[PDB]
From Swiss-Prot, chains A, B, C:
Listed name of the protein: 2-succinyl-5-enolpyruvyl-6-hydroxy-3-cyclohexene-1-carboxylate synthase
Pfam families per the UniProt record, alphabetical: TPP_enzyme_C (PF02775), TPP_enzyme_M_2 (PF16582), TPP_enzyme_N (PF02776)
Documented EC number(s): 2.2.1.9
Pathway given in the UniProt record: Quinol/quinone metabolism; 1,4-dihydroxy-2-naphthoate biosynthesis; 1,4-dihydroxy-2-naphthoate from chorismate: step 2/7; Quinol/quinone metabolism; menaquinone biosynthesis
Expression induction or repression: By isopropyl-beta-D-thiogalactoside (IPTG).
InterPro entries, A to Z: MenaQ_synth_MenD (IPR004433), MenD_middle (IPR032264), THDP-binding (IPR029061), Thiamin_PyroP_enz_TPP-bd_dom (IPR012001), TPP_enzyme_TPP-bd (IPR011766)
GO terms, molecular function: 2-succinyl-5-enolpyruvyl-6-hydroxy-3-cyclohexene-1-carboxylic-acid synthase activity; magnesium ion binding; manganese ion binding; protein homodimerization activity; thiamine pyrophosphate binding
Native species: Escherichia coli (strain K12)
Length: 556, 556, 556
């Protein structure tokens, strides 16, 4: 009876079970207690293995992989704070739906709360942020393998969205010669080992029914709001709203083509909000709305009914409107509630939106971050994808740019953390294999700086733009008090990123003008490597430029 | 009734209450939801403020400050994944006793579970790892200020060791002019505002009683095991064990002067374990024993009684011996249980230890990490302190070096995470103002790389030795299969650290021999700045040198 | 490898371990899954076994035993809702400190969440209400017996107060021939089996330090408030306050002799409140103060310092005064802070207390519940003890009677549940062997009615007075709205208790006047049995009488 061998048979059942639920990517950090899990995964030919030394970055790498692939993505870490570092990505997945399967090695129960090295209390340490939590018992042949495979199958099969924490205690010895221990225990499962389905198939679907009064509401004065959704969903929603004749307020994350662009500006104009008061229903598809003026308009508007369609569960309207919360695949939902051609009812807002875009176009020349956002369309890689960071970049693009319909945009806009953007971008790139443009701020790039290691391996060109305004300049846009703004809010670090690029052998450009930025991009798309482009700009120009465009358009 | 003003009065009560329990250092990360806490702290003259952009590093900075200063240390972060990043340091503090007071700003309850940006479930998110958890209510004048201060005073007053999670929801508006809203609410507390004491004094002491049969047991054949303790405590334990005539097995963390050095080697010798079988009692002071051979001997020994004296609560013997678990300040415990002069009963172990050290000296010449550990006394700054990283460095120093009695050693040997070593060393340096030698591995340095930002501000010279053996070479010691060793265990990243140091404008050396290392040190001690010394060594030389020395000493 | 036998050896280690921490009484409910625990308990001769069929009642029986004996009391229930029924007594123990050890049998992990009969999720099902929770692992010889005993030893050894939940999963077969499986596993513990000590002695004492400025504060104008404490402690507190010349406000639970009786009445008089605002310090010993006027005076008074001395931990002043919380054995605390002989400073309150008592005595004649309460001192059994139920009985006794110093009083005044009073009283009687007077209301008697089964076995006479005012007439005392008062507050059940008594073969009396009541008492004290005395009174006479006395005394 080799405990080491049986540990690995147990682990093998876990990993093999995960392959029956679409787990292809597995992100592994180093350790010894994780040996049963890590070796079982290394020997399993279904997996693509990714490795990293920072478990926080590892969780975000998995998050980007799951985010793009729409499949569950596995993680293996050893016991201790390695497990805790998964918390940020797990929380994000809890908000936006990524299926992260966290296999967290643990000490056996006899070694907890007795002063053993690298042993902590792991069951339940993520509280309610996992969708499902499994604390596996101490491995033993007296618990049949069909129990273990059934537990995994229940968790993955019923997983609508979010993370799964599977705590995996293993007792030492962890190494030794692998004999027959556990083989007949495994072979109890018979030809399941040669099958391609779960041992237990439990996959109920969670979805809202057709709205039987839709033929009434689609003829009222409605507004369509498009939040985060897939690229194809964005094109379908644009066509649907156009057909209804309802104005479409389209978020940077919507990939609708934003037919009424610069909503963050023109929603600040009284003629627009006055026109939107006529709306009798608001139908929102997707969530995590980006722009400040849009969140204020949502909070203040009073349609008779407010609907939010999304495949995420729970309430998504932070203003708590009377109305409906409809759980569905958006494309399914649109087919279930088709539009019928009706003439448009807005007259003032299309003109305001065009005038707003003209007001931004008037200011495109300065080599600043607002202008980079406004012009970002010109740098999108063909057949590529955009990963947009948090703080000012996503806000400025949403307010100032009109992104093409169906061009994929990815982001971390659940909790909007600045702590994993580089490694998330790495996973986003690796999952699809597409050329990738990623744009982040300086503090964000410092936060996830060691994920540049991961960016040394990309399967297609990845451009990382670091906007360096020397601090978190979103807080210059906020009414912070001037006496404490720098030390306690902006926190300028006074760095550049050429030495960072050189450390990880990444190409680097610090362009001084539009010509040099173009040159840097043209060089960058030529090889499957990461190029770091640092755009150094004056601290508060971007925030000021947005405030000024905001005032101007409000006076139209 | 300005929400903004009252928010700031509420927060002001929280921070001022913390000043009555010795909180002096406060570590602050940037954010908007945290504005009430951050501004209250910025206005309160009792605090020393430290700032950082990475909240994981922020937590470890607080941990090092608290570890050295023995004072409770406060942290302020904004809502979201920023809170989750505190989990590693919080867990470590729960193991080794540092008092971290985490003021975690939160959205108000009406903005939880409704799709609100940067809003997550924060109460209870640290599960059972905080010593105390306080989920403060939504601020309101209808709850009296004496409840708020009384709750904080209860948490801080009863805090024997570990972290306190104080979750602080605040509703917007967060900014505005300070009017008199909440002023009379504050003035309910009277002249407590001019006092220097808690509003409620609740400070019961948790301490074990004097052992009435101690005069019986001190006459038996005992062994003293000295784990992590204060420097003064290490010296007192040395004198105490010497007077009793009992052998002292002294950990690298013990600061006892290790009179039987290289215990990790001679404990592998059957004559040593045979002599130690004669011991009728083992009295261990401190815990988190470092060495493998020591943990194995502790696991196998069967004294009549095994005692562990420590100010940490709970079980500390991972082998679960029959015996006693005594909660006490170690110096206090020694005074309550004095030694009586007795002739020593060990004869063979002193000789074995002298031979072990001589065998190590025979190998001191190679420019390797085993030799660096062995020779490390030659580089300790006068009246300074040593911060020792995890994995091979602490193990090699413990096995191969004899550190001087009472010279301060610091570490993160609770969970032994490699995720916060640089920011912890920064806090350790700032707490004492002493010149500091910190030594970490390459993967540890990459893990906490951005904490080089913090090392741009030290009050005395800090030498950071980064031992670069290209991966986690502690894992070459385990019998992992060679087929997966590099990719799935060692994870070499193939970097150097010259550009990291240059990025943060820190002096850098890559010495090639002992004299160049001496030159680097002499350069480093001249100014109160951080110097990065990268020691490049071959992958497995250190590990296999330790194995060979173990075989040699074990066959003596 | 008999699973049945090993289950029983694992259980045997658990029970034997408890005998080393003073567990003498064990309360057992019937079941099959609990067989290992139950049979281990039955063959262990250290225990006194009590049985009951209602697990809620069983927990309260354990609570009464622990409440009197001040020793830990063990409980065994089987899996399922039986475990949930322990919650009330566990919560009460969490407030007032009884050490109830809950051994809750469980299904093994492979039978959780799979549709198995009588299997529920039991780990953590009591949330934070146990002082300590242990979720034992699935029994196996691969976890050594020293681990199990050390876990129990940690839990019991550090238990200052409150409950311990020990969840004990067992896999079938539960029955079978008892062979040698697990015998050498037990024997690893050596002669620990013949010992009388814990395997691990871990017993730190939690106690507040001596107040170094006590000689300053005892010379000021103080008030002594005496809450729940032991009978001895009540006598010592009376002597101490008398020595200081400080007024003593003595609760019904204090056993101080209440030298200023009827505080619930004279505290309503403004001359008392005005004189009491001269007080510079209030020293309260014990907690769970009974009377409304006393709670109101505590809420409004503002001494310079407010101290609460008690052996219960945590805050105990629901008004959150500036002052001190001091954790100590109350008698020890008085010896550490002795009184000094000083002239009394109150003049008006003694006159008021005397006049108030006179006002109550003027109304002693009517055959009502207020008069029974007022006259209860004249009926206490010699060398006996009083168990006072919740709602009006304890309020009226506290307001209207003067109980003798040092005469034992017991109650459930933590959460003041009306759900376990009869079974608690049974435990109170069985623990001390003393003749017992227990007084409850009609709804309270219905709540725990089947606990009449337990009252068939008492070791000395127990009188159970059931005051039948046809509903919860405390809700006639509150300003409830009259239109809904009967159906939704009073809830009269219109029963008597003659047939209940008859069902359990208990002697029964329904006295119609004082003479018949005294005859009933005289009959009852002659034999070691339970006699039920039902006192039928008109619904609102007690509540109104108390209101009238309050108004009258308030105008003196
Ligand atoms: C892990 C964590 N911790 C702290 C924060 C708080 N937080 C922000 C949110 O408030 C902004 C959410 C949003 O975009 O809506 S923004 C921000 C500064 C960003 O600095 P930058 O990269 O230089 O970019 P710039 O501001 O354009 O100059 C911080 C520090 C966080 N989000 N996540
Ligand atoms: C946050 C987290 N995540 C993962 C781990 C697992 N873990 C280790 C545990 O074995 C440490 C037990 C010990 O320190 O004795 S060591 C180690 C590699 C260290 O690489 P290095 O700095 O180059 O040093 P070297 O090995 O001497 O070459 C890892 C990755 C962890 N501890 N903490
Ligand atoms: C398990 C549970 N559930 C409900 C309650 C609420 N509760 C009470 C407490 O609130 C009284 C607070 C106190 O005593 O300080 S009293 C009470 C009615 C009692 O009726 P009775 O026995 O006929 O006695 P009488 O009112 O004097 O005639 C109820 C129903 C509870 N305490 N516990
Ligand atoms: Mg910035
Ligand atoms: Mg290394
Ligand atoms: Mg009643």
């Amino acid at each position: 009876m080799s405990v080491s061998a049986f540990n690995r048979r147990w682990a093998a059942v876990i990993l093999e079970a995960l392959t029956r639920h679409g787990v292809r990517h597995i992100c592994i950090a180093p350790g010894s207690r994780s040996t049963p899990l890590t070796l079982a995964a290394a020997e399993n030919s279904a997996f693509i293995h990714h490795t990293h030394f920072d478990e926080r970055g590892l969780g975000h790498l998995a998050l980007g992989l799951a985010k793009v692939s729409k499949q569950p993505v596995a993680v293996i870490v050893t016991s201790g704070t390695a497990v805790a570092n998964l918390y940020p990505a797990l929380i994000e997945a809890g908000l936006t739906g990524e299926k992260l399967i966290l296999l967290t090695a643990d000490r056996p129960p006899e070694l907890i709360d007795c002063g053993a090295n690298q042993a902590i209390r792991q069951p339940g340490m993520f509280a309610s942020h996992p969708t499902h939590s499994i604390s596996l018992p101490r491995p033993t042949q007296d618990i049949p393998a069909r129990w273990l495979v059934s537990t995994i199958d229940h968790a993955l099969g019923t997983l609508h969205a979010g993370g799964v924490h599977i705590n995996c205690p293993f007792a030492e010895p962890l190494y030794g010669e692998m004999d027959d221990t556990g083989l007949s225990w495994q072979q109890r499962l018979g030809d399941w080992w040669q099958d391609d389905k779960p041992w237990l198939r439990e996959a109920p679907r969670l979805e809202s029914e057709k709205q039987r009064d839709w033929f009434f509401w689609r003829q009222k004065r409605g507004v369509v709001v498009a939040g985060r959704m897939s690229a194809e969903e964005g094109k379908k929603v644009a066509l649907w709203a156009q057909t209804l004749g309802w104005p479409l307020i389209g978020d940077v994350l919507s990939q609708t083509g934003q037919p009424l662009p610069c909503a963050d500006l023109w929603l600040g104009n009284a003629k627009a909000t006055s026109e939107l008061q006529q709306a009798q229903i608001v139908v929102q598809l997707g969530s995590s709305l980006t722009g400040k003026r849009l969140l204020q308009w949502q909070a203040s508007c009073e349609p008779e009914e407010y609907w939010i369609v999304d495949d995420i569960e729970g309430r998504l309207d932070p203003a708590h409107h009377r109305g409906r919360r409809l759980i569905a695949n958006i494309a399914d939902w649109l087919e279930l509630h088709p539009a019928e051609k009706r003439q448009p009812w807005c007259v003032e807002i299309p003109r305001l939106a065009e005038q707003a875009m003209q007001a931004v176009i008037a200011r495109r020349d300065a080599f600043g971050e607002a202008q980079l956002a406004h012009r970002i369309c010109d740098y999108l890689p063909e057949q590529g994808q955009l990963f947009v960071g948090n703080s000012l970049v996503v806000k400025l693009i949403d307010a100032l740019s009109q992104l093409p319909a169906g061009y994929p945009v990815y982001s971390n806009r659940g909790a909007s953390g600045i702590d994993g953007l580089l490694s998330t971008a790495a996973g986003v790139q690796r999952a699809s294999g597409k050329p990738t443009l990623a744009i982040v701020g300086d503090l964000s790039a410092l936060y996830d700086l060691n994920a540049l290691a991961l960016l040394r391996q990309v399967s297609a060109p990845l451009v990382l733009i670091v906007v360096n305004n020397n601090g978190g300049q979103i807080f210059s846009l906020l009414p912070t008090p001037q006496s404490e703004r720098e030390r306690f809010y902006l926190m300028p670090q006074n760095v550049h990123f050429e030495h960072a690029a050189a450390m990880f052998e990444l190409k680097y450009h610090r362009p001084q003008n539009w010509q040099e930025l173009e040159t840097a991009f043209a060089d960058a798309w030529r090889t499957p490597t990461t190029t770091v482009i640092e755009m150094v700009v004056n601290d508060t120009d971007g925030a000021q430029t947005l405030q000024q465009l905001l005032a101007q358009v409000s006076h139209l």
